[PDB]
Amino acid sequence: KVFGRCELAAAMKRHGLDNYRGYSLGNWVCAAKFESNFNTQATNRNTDGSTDYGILQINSRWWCNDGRTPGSRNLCNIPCSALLSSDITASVNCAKKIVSDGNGMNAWVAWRNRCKGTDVQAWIRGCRL
Numbered sequence: 001k002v003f004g005r006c007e008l009a010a011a012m013k014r015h016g017l018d019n020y021r022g023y024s025l026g027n028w029v030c031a032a033k034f035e036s037n038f039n040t041q042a043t044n045r046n047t048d049g050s051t052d053y054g055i056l057q058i059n060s061r062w063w064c065n066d067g068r069t070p071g072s073r074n075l076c077n078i079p080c081s082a083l084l085s086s087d088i089t090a091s092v093n094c095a096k097k098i099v100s101d102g103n104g105m106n107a108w109v110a111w112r113n114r115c116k117g118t119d120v121q122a123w124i125r126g127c128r129l
């Protein structure tokens with residue numbers, strides 16, 4: 001599913017991401033924009049053999065099981081395919097664990113390089129929330 005900007009903002013808010021770990025909703029929407037362009041079916045293969053999945057490009061080295069990342073963990077206790085669903089519940093629940101892991105949203109390199117420090121409120125501007 002390819003979400004609209006305000007549609008995704010509303011879904012993220014319903015699942016408790018707004019201000020989670022102190023990160024406003026615009027931070028999460030901005031991260032999703034540059035990780036996946038709002039597409040739940042986005043995937044990206046990494047040089048180390050791991051793969052990133054879903055609207056927040058969550059990685060199989062630590063967070064989900066795909067059966068093809070030797071030595072990896074599955075800290076969100078889900079198949080990576082669950083991160084590709086049209087329903088964002090699994091991605092949100094796993095993102096909550098990731099952002100609590102110590103480095104906040106710096107866990108998403110694209111957030112650090114493209115959202116951090118910017119006017120992230122623009123990403124929810126105009127949305128009925």
Ligand SMILES: [Cl-]
Nearest residue numbers: 024025026121
């Ligand atoms: Cl915001």
Ligand SMILES: [Cl-]
Nearest residue numbers: 065066067068
């Ligand atoms: Cl497996």
Ligand SMILES: [Cl-]
Nearest residue numbers: 109110113114
């Ligand atoms: Cl980047």
Ligand SMILES: [K+]
Nearest residue numbers: 067068069070
């Ligand atoms: K594996």
Ligand code: NA
Nearest residue numbers: 060064072073
């Ligand atoms: Na894994």
